[PDB]
Amino acid sequence: MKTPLTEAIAAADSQGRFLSNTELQVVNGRYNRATSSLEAAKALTANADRLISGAANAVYSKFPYTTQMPGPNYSSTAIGKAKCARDIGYYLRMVTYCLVVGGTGPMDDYLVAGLEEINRTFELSPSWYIEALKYIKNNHGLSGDVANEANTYIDYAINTLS
Amino acid sequence: MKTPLTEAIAAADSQGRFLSNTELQVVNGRYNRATSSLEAAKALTANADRLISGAANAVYSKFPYTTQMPGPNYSSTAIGKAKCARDIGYYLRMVTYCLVVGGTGPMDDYLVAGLEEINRTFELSPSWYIEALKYIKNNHGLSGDVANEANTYIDYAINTLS
Amino acid sequence: MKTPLTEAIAAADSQGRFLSNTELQVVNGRYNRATSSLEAAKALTANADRLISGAANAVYSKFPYTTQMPGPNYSSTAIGKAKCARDIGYYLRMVTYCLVVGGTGPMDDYLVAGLEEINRTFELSPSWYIEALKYIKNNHGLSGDVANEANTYIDYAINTLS
Amino acid sequence: MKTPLTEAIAAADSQGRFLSNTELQVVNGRYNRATSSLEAAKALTANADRLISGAANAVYSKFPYTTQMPGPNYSSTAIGKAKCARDIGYYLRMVTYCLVVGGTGPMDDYLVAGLEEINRTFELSPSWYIEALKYIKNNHGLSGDVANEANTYIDYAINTLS
Amino acid sequence: MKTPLTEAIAAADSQGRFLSNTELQVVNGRYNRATSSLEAAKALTANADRLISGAANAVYSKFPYTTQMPGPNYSSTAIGKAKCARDIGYYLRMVTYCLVVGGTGPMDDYLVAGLEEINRTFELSPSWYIEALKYIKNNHGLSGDVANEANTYIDYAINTLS
Amino acid sequence: MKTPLTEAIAAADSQGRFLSNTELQVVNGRYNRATSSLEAAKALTANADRLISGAANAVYSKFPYTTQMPGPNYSSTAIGKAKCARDIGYYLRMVTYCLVVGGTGPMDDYLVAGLEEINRTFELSPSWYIEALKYIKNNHGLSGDVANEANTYIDYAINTLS
Amino acid sequence: MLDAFAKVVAQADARGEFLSNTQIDALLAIVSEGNKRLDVVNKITNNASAIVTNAARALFAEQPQLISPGGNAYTSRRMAACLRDMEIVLRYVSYAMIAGDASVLDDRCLNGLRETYQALGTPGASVAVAIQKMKDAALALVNDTTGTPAGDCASLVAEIATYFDRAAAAVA
Amino acid sequence: MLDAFAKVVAQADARGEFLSNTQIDALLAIVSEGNKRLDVVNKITNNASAIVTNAARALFAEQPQLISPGGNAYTSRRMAACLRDMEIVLRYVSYAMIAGDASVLDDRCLNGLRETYQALGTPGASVAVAIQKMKDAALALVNDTTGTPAGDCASLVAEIATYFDRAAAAVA
Amino acid sequence: MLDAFAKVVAQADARGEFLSNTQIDALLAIVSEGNKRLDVVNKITNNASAIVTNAARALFAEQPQLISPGGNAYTSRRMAACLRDMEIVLRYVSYAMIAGDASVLDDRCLNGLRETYQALGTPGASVAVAIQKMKDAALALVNDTTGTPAGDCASLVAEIATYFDRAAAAVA
Amino acid sequence: MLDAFAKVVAQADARGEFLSNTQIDALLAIVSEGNKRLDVVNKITNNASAIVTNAARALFAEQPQLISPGGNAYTSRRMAACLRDMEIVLRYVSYAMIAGDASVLDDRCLNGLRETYQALGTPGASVAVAIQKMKDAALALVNDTTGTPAGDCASLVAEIATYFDRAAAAVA
Amino acid sequence: MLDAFAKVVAQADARGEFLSNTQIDALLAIVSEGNKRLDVVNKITNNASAIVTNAARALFAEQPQLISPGGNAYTSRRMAACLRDMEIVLRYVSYAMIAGDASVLDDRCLNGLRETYQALGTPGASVAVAIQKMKDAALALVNDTTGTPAGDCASLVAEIATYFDRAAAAVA
Amino acid sequence: MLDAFAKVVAQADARGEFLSNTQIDALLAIVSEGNKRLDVVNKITNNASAIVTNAARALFAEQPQLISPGGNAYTSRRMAACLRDMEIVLRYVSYAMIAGDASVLDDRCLNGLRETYQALGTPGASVAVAIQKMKDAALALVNDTTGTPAGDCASLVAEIATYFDRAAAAVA
Ligand SMILES: *[C@@H](C)[C@H]1/C(=C/C2=NC(=C\c3[nH]c(C[C@H]4NC(=O)C(C=C)=C4C)c(C)c3CCC(=O)O)/C(CCC(=O)O)=C2C)NC(=O)[C@@H]1C
């Protein structure tokens, strides 16, 4: 997908040229941040269920109608609660993928393209998922530039949902 | 001109997007290298006249005919000689600008674009200038990654002339 | 603005030709249905405030949280309640306009173009407005083909939102 | 083939959308006028040979030289007379076809496209055929709006030739 | 307009180049035939009225209906006969212009572009003018390559009218 | 390749037209010159080895370093010398082909296209080849327009190298 | 492009107003005269070549300097361009009559037509006589009966007359 | 693209024949059922999003492997492409119903759809269940009364049923 | 595209040879007939409309089937396309005749004609009859004298007879 | 577009000079603040939707006129275009802040804005109020701490305050 | 584009006139000096690189400010643009020489060159020196015997001198 | 296009899985040798003209039939196309080296090269010799100390050697 390394190769290839020291400096920027990014990805994978279940109950406490109101698209059913937690798990998993390739490539490719359409079609509200994402920001426990890395992609998702 | 930073801005701007973490990593890689680059530029600027004089002397040693063949495009004249040392100074000055911005942009804009035509029309051989760049490479006095930065842009000029 | 007459002129003009008997048969189809259409606009206009107030109250009974949750995009404020009523009045107005010209053009020009972006940005839910239109549909009072007309545009609106 | 129904499908399809109430009002305009149109086709078909023979003889009385001048493109030959009668029968046929589909499409597809080139090449005069159509117009016998219909397509034909 | 000399200049200029020996050979071909072409032009100018009046009576003897049949577009009126001879004079004058620039440029520019339209619009028959052109071929009195030159452009006009 | 004749065919064919008198004049100019061209080619082919040997000798006299400087791209070797005389034979052979077809087409197709890249990459100077073409020009032994034809294509090669 | 109905809707939205009953009854009158207006444009549409060529003949008979050598309608390219324009004007007038509003006329045709002719050196006044001729010809034809029912079309004739004058005025 | 009327005209011209009275009376029957067919497509056109999403929900509830990781409707791009296609099929069926002929269906949609899905690895059979679902949903809706006059639409329902099966068959 | 001179040159380059005196002498002979060649081509160029119309009329007199309702030259669009292909084959034979080489005929025109007429349903044998008729006409006119010095053009007629058969054989 | 490094270099080339130790030293200082700079820009990039919506809401609360029927932000198309221009000005201030130079702001964006809003009838002063509000928001967030080492970003805030005013002054 | 023969034709047509025999005798005179004209153009066409480079070296030896850092011919892009312009001018002067008329020159090359150089900051004065240098070099070459028969070309060099002066004057 | 990090991501997503810590430790290992990888690519990026020209001269010294008249590298157009291909291959091998994965190579460069050379008549065998020559030259350069710290690059040269062998094998 789009990553810092494939973008350098695409910019050079379009121009029919060998990579320049500008592109090599670019890839070095990625190798320099990458240790912060893979460590943030480890802590997020290790606490994956805690973050998914906590975020989903953060949404149910802020919007209690989603657990009470009848219909296929709310969390009033066992199934509905399972799909809602499954969707939150997709945002967290795409975030770890963005941390290991160092670009928003996976989230854009696997989650963002088509999202407005499926959300309007199935009447899923962006506001529900902004609550889920804020909860996982607030208690992943990361600090320093490890936190800075994970929050940059978590905030990206919030701006895609506006 | 293209520098790492303007290239990052242009990529996001063509997509109608704010910079992402990908570009911030990119620019960081430039701030990382930039200390080696500016140091390479200081020592290259401080030894400019010695490197220009020695380089000119080195192509007259490898190509003796250049100072004996009559005509405006040889170093047989005093003007022939002043024009030749001037052109070698252009190659050194443009290389310090590449060092300062972290891209080949200034040498591309101010020297490579249009070079084939002027050398053809004025009958200037690329080989003469490759011998001068090699001399500078071989004796600028730098070490480690400061040397590695100088050498990357002097090698770029050699590859433009083949 | 796209009306039946304007679409007929734009096509003939696109092919650099005078209108054909086909375009005249299509403008005849508008003139024939129009009587139903102006009856429907006239009644819906006369019952505008009843329909707006009742439709607003239908949304708040179906989605009580919008009356209780704090913040500018809900109905828990005097301003919020005014803006919500205002918005439903905008939908009813553009529907009477579509009836007067025989096409979705007024609604498309004035309301559909840009909607997705403003409802994402202000976090307004399409489901709220669908509830409003369903209420207007269920009690404008019209019958037979005047009802047929008003419902085709009120359902167009719901399909824009679904 | 361009008919009112086909033009409505092609436009909606061009914009990737379902048909609108506008396109439904235009197909209603065709269905409303069609009764006149099939009456006219039916009568003109039943009086085809009278109308063809009489129209042929109208041309030869107005332009007697075509009966007297030698060579394949005139009516001074058995073959020439047959081909002339044949051609006028082609015009009457395509007019009944336009009446059945509510557009000039059959006549445009089958007869207008290519006409100029064949009448230059075979040196056939447009004025001969205009005389034929004027005769059919002046004595098909129809009245009121069935006459209105048949004359719109017979005059279309004359404008193609003028 | 298009002449052998401006075409050589356009072919070279499109390719951004100086004229080649291919284009100089081309212009020499034109200087070589030009004496035959200007002599043919002198004899045709000298006999201009004889050729115009003779050709117009050749048309009236072959198609006598054009002098008898009533209406603005025939030679039955003094005016009509004056316009018909004026039109034949245009074909002869454009032919002398083609002989002096050595290309069909003037006839294409001044007479051929738009011709089908004005001839169909005003119901003028191409066959009338083919008779006029054949008459001037048959008695301009030229021989050898002077005749060959004038006939090549006279025949060009007949093929434009088919 | 482009010759006067294929260029004439291509011009008419791009307009979907038969050749006009313009192109026939064009081709005639080629048949006129062609006697000088083929004669130039006969004497140039018959003195080919003398002109190639003498031309090679002439650049080694103007540029003595070419036979003393070590390396694959100089005439210091026996292979260096065979490759140099071979390349001079290519320039003479391509010039006789230009003579035979009356266009620079064969030298453009077989030698100019791609020349800048190979001379750059193999470090071959255009000046060396300009000295060889000048020698051939100066002593091929031709007179009048046979000489004028030879000289036009040898001068074309000099201008390609500047 | 706006038709009669859309021009009102547009005005009411800029004021955030629903259409009044007066405004509604007024657009019901136009739907009442529908049949007639369709006959009106059908009569122009079916005589289009005749209206342009006959009007063109009359113009050149009155202003023969247009077709003399060096005149602006001399050569086949210029004459063809001149017949084409008369047809363009007759087309946009047919459209303005169907829309019931002058907007398509002004937007897609009459705009800039003065330096289109002024820069070209084309006599605006001769172009104006052509439109006058086409108007006379088309008002005559709109009143012929045979295949259409007789009644009063004075209203519609004053309307096509305005659209023609509109065009004629814009070029001069 | 041909509608019902044009298909006959086309056949008669290849034989150089005028249309017979039988053929004429037959096209008069379709004009008689005009009103109903317009209601039929209006009912689909006004419920279009509901027909696609409800039918889509049912498909994924019956075939949950389509939306599991690695499934052909997993990720937002693939799901969006799948909802889009169901809508494309419902659109061309609406067109075939208005034309009264299957030609637009076959020409502008059903053609090549088997390697469009076969090369992609898309299950033709699941696409076929989607169309079945959309058919069931749309036949139901075409029979609802409220704002339309009651009568017999059995004819038209057998017609939309064929057009749906046509589409469903072409992908499998 | 290659003419007779460039063809020899491309073969010599592939062998790395200068042309022989034989080859040079053979090309001088084409240059000597140059004026006769330009007359042959100007005769075709001058009578081009007559050559395809007269040859088309002859064909439809022989194979009336082509123009009956349903036939491949029936309808104005199909007839206009048949006359056009006749004129295209005449142009390319002209081109081949000026160049002295079959190259332009083969690559820019006959490449795919058999296949195109087959897929289209155009009868290849009838196209071949049209070309034979144009050949007969064109050899007749190439021998007419008036504005031309009398002499022998026997070889140029045999050569243009070859180009017509090349084209007649590429359609079936 | 130029950044802070290329700007110095283009001035030196025009004088034919190598850069001085002063100039080199001044550019080393920008590199030393590089990490603070990337944090400033990431704060804007991370809060971009909030910054234009909150700043747009504030504006329509102050100037309600803009959103009443007929106002320049009335209708969904006009509102969507107003929010879009707010976001465009934020992007270009981001760009100017990463480069350390006003160039991209001035040439790729403000060039013609005064004129465009004037011709359009968009109220320039209100656009300037929207930019002032986005400035206030953006300086607030640039000073927030969490995931950022505490320190002084005083100069970078003064510098980004300059880019916001440049943009606010180019509209009136 | 107009050559000498088409200019007369174009003037006569506006007057509706056939050319007179004196006008024809004047064109016969041009055709008479054609081989000399062809020789003039071939000496430019064969020495074009020498004429541009040698006239460029003299310009920069005279005006060295042009090549100092910051001068309008400094850097390779500008030196290459300058040599390219000198060649565009030398091409258009050779075209006007073949045409025997300056319209090619005025229309393509010269139209707005002052506006362009003025706008770019190029010294029109220095461009004029470059043209005058190319004029002297080219006039000397046109009069060299070798490959060409000795005779009088005085009229042709007065005519290229005028075209060169026309280019020099249209740049300022 | 996929680099090493995106390949793993793409395999995990199809399984709906988060990456495991061993998978993460393997990517941490790549990031560890990054400076060496950057040095490898920069030695190719800095010697590219030498590597292509010197490997080309050895190929033509070994296979002189390639440059004899009629050989596939004879004439300037073909010699230039050949040197260009050798460079397209050397570029794509450097891209795959930066990517740490061959997908760039397979997809863009290698896809159908055998079909293309086969179709053009180019000896795939001779192209393979050209790649193998570029592989030896490039492996020797990647291991030169000067400007770079002495250490072990054995793993990286085994990896460029594999990319070079992949290109050599996909041409036949
Ligand atoms: C086999 C390829 C080489 C070899 C390479 C080594 N390079 C080592 C260290 C090193 N290389 C770089 C340069 C690189 N980083 C960049 O960011 C850029 C481009 C923007 C380049 C071209 C860096 C910065 C370093 C310096 C480390 C330091 O501060 O000292 C190195 C040591 C191991 C390692 O650090 O990965 C080696 C072995 N060594 C060889 O002997 C050959 C020829």
Side-chain angles (χ1 to χ4, degrees), chain F residues 1-10 12-21 24 27-28 30-32 34-35 38-39 41-42 44-45 48 52 89 92-94 96-97 100-101 106 110, chain I residues 1-3 5-7 9-19 21 24-25 27-28 30-31 34-35 37-38 41-42 44-45 48 52 87 90-92 94-96 98-100 104 108:
Chain F
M1 52 196 97
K2 61 136 281 187
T3 71
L5 314 206
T6 59
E7 259 186 9
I9 284 157
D13 190 35
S14 50
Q15 282 163 250
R17 153 207 137 209
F18 286 81
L19 284 8
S20 79
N21 205 54
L24 261 46
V27 177
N28 173 242
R30 169 58 193 142
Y31 294 149
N32 267 37
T35 334
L38 284 8
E39 187 58 42
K42 276 162 167 162
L44 251 25
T45 296
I52 294 168
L92 182 60
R93 206 170 109 229
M94 294 309 128
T96 68
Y97 296 163
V100 163
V101 302
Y110 308 144
Chain I
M1 168 183 42
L2 242 41
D3 52 23
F5 302 87
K7 192 198 208 63
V9 160
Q11 293 178 175
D13 187 55
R15 305 165 286 166
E17 279 157 2
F18 291 78
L19 273 66
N21 278 319
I24 292 297
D25 285 2
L27 291 178
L28 271 116
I30 295 174
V31 171
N35 282 138
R37 178 155 227 132
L38 264 32
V41 179
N42 192 216
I44 292 175
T45 279
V52 332
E87 187 207 88
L90 232 208
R91 299 196 285 121
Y92 280 94
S94 285
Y95 297 164
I98 258 298
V104 65
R108 297 212 180 191

Side-chain angles (χ1 to χ4, degrees), chain J residues 14-166:
Chain J
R15 305 165 286 166
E17 279 157 2
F18 291 78
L19 273 66
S20 64
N21 278 319
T22 299
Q23 288 171 299
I24 292 297
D25 285 2
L27 291 178
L28 271 116
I30 295 174
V31 171
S32 291
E33 286 217 305
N35 282 138
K36 291 183 194 160
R37 178 155 227 132
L38 264 32
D39 283 311
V40 178
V41 179
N42 192 216
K43 273 276 173 44
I44 292 175
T45 279
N46 279 11
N47 295 281
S49 298
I51 294 165
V52 332
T53 306
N54 288 343
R57 183 149 51 223
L59 177 68
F60 304 130
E62 283 178 23
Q63 293 177 27
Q65 336 132 8
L66 275 19
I67 46 171
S68 286
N72 199 67
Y74 169 67
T75 67
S76 303
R77 187 206 283 140
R78 283 215 283 268
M79 179 77 253
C82 176
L83 291 168
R84 179 204 74 211
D85 301 349
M86 284 185 68
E87 187 207 88
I88 280 172
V89 175
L90 232 208
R91 299 196 285 121
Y92 280 94
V93 176
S94 285
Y95 297 164
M97 195 59 205
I98 258 298
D101 199 67
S103 159
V104 65
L105 186 53
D106 301 339
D107 347 300
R108 297 212 180 191
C109 186
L110 277 39
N111 186 43
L113 220 40
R114 208 193 294 272
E115 300 112 295
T116 293
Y117 287 149
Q118 275 163 3
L120 277 159
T122 305
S126 312
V127 179
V129 177
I131 298 149
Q132 240 68 268
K133 285 184 177 302
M134 295 194 278
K135 174 190 172 191
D136 285 336
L139 304 199
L141 292 159
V142 168
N143 269 296
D144 283 358
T145 341
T146 5
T148 297
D152 180 77
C153 300
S155 20
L156 299 169
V157 162
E159 187 186 355
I160 175 202
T162 290
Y163 297 139
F164 273 112
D165 296 334
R166 286 191 137 284

Side-chain angles (χ1 to χ4, degrees), chain A residues 25 28, chain B residues 145 148, chain L residues 35-36 38-40 142-145 149-151 153:
Chain A
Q25 282 170 112
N28 167 248
Chain B
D145 280 287
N148 198 207
Chain L
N35 283 143
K36 290 183 197 173
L38 255 40
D39 271 321
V40 173
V142 172
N143 225 121
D144 288 29
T145 33
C153 295

Side-chain angles (χ1 to χ4, degrees), chain G residues 37-105:
Chain G
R37 189 186 297 270
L38 246 31
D39 282 313
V40 176
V41 292
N42 194 43
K43 274 287 203 303
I44 293 174
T45 276
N46 282 341
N47 285 278
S49 302
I51 291 172
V52 174
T53 309
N54 288 334
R57 178 142 47 234
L59 168 67
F60 298 123
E62 289 179 23
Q63 285 176 51
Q65 23 107 51
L66 298 183
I67 59 179
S68 286
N72 200 69
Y74 165 69
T75 74
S76 290
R77 189 187 291 276
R78 290 202 223 110
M79 179 74 183
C82 177
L83 291 170
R84 176 208 57 199
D85 293 358
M86 287 174 68
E87 206 201 52
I88 300 324
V89 171
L90 194 71
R91 253 169 63 214
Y92 284 105
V93 169
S94 130
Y95 299 156
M97 190 73 197
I98 258 299
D101 180 63
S103 87
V104 63
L105 188 57

Side-chain angles (χ1 to χ4, degrees), chain A residues 11-162:
Chain A
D13 188 40
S14 60
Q15 300 172 67
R17 52 172 188 71
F18 280 85
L19 261 32
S20 63
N21 211 217
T22 307
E23 277 125 292
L24 301 192
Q25 282 170 112
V26 163
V27 178
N28 167 248
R30 175 51 195 153
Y31 294 152
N32 248 76
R33 255 242 154 159
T35 39
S36 289
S37 322
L38 304 183
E39 176 46 39
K42 295 194 186 71
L44 287 184
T45 301
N47 300 283
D49 284 288
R50 194 249 294 164
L51 297 161
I52 291 161
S53 300
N57 210 62
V59 180
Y60 303 150
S61 309
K62 215 226 195 178
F63 306 103
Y65 68 97
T66 64
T67 56
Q68 294 173 322
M69 211 164 280
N73 63 295
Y74 298 103
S75 289
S76 5
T77 59
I79 282 173
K81 297 193 184 71
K83 283 178 187 288
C84 180
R86 172 260 252 160
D87 289 358
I88 291 165
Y90 291 165
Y91 282 85
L92 182 59
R93 190 160 53 88
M94 297 309 158
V95 173
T96 67
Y97 292 165
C98 293
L99 272 332
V100 326
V101 313
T104 58
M107 205 187 291
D108 297 336
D109 199 351
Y110 303 146
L111 191 143
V112 180
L115 194 58
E116 297 169 273
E117 284 128 284
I118 65 101
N119 273 177
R120 204 208 305 116
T121 304
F122 284 100
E123 291 180 87
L124 280 12
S125 173
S127 313
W128 301 342
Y129 300 88
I130 288 168
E131 259 305 296
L133 280 17
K134 286 292 186 183
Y135 176 90
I136 109 102
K137 274 168 75 188
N138 286 344
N139 47 253
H140 48 228
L142 276 1
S143 51
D145 278 304
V146 180
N148 189 200
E149 272 297 292
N151 291 342
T152 300
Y153 298 108
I154 293 297
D155 287 326
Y156 177 76
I158 292 174
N159 283 280
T160 279
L161 297 152
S162 199

Side-chain angles (χ1 to χ4, degrees), chain E residues 55-116:
Chain E
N57 210 62
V59 180
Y60 303 150
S61 309
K62 215 226 195 178
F63 306 103
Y65 68 97
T66 64
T67 56
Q68 294 173 322
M69 211 164 280
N73 63 295
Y74 298 103
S75 289
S76 5
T77 59
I79 282 173
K81 297 193 184 71
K83 283 178 187 288
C84 180
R86 172 260 252 160
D87 289 358
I88 291 165
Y90 291 165
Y91 282 85
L92 182 59
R93 190 160 53 88
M94 297 309 158
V95 173
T96 67
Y97 292 165
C98 293
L99 272 332
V100 326
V101 313
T104 58
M107 205 187 291
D108 297 336
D109 199 351
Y110 303 146
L111 191 143
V112 180
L115 194 58
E116 297 169 273

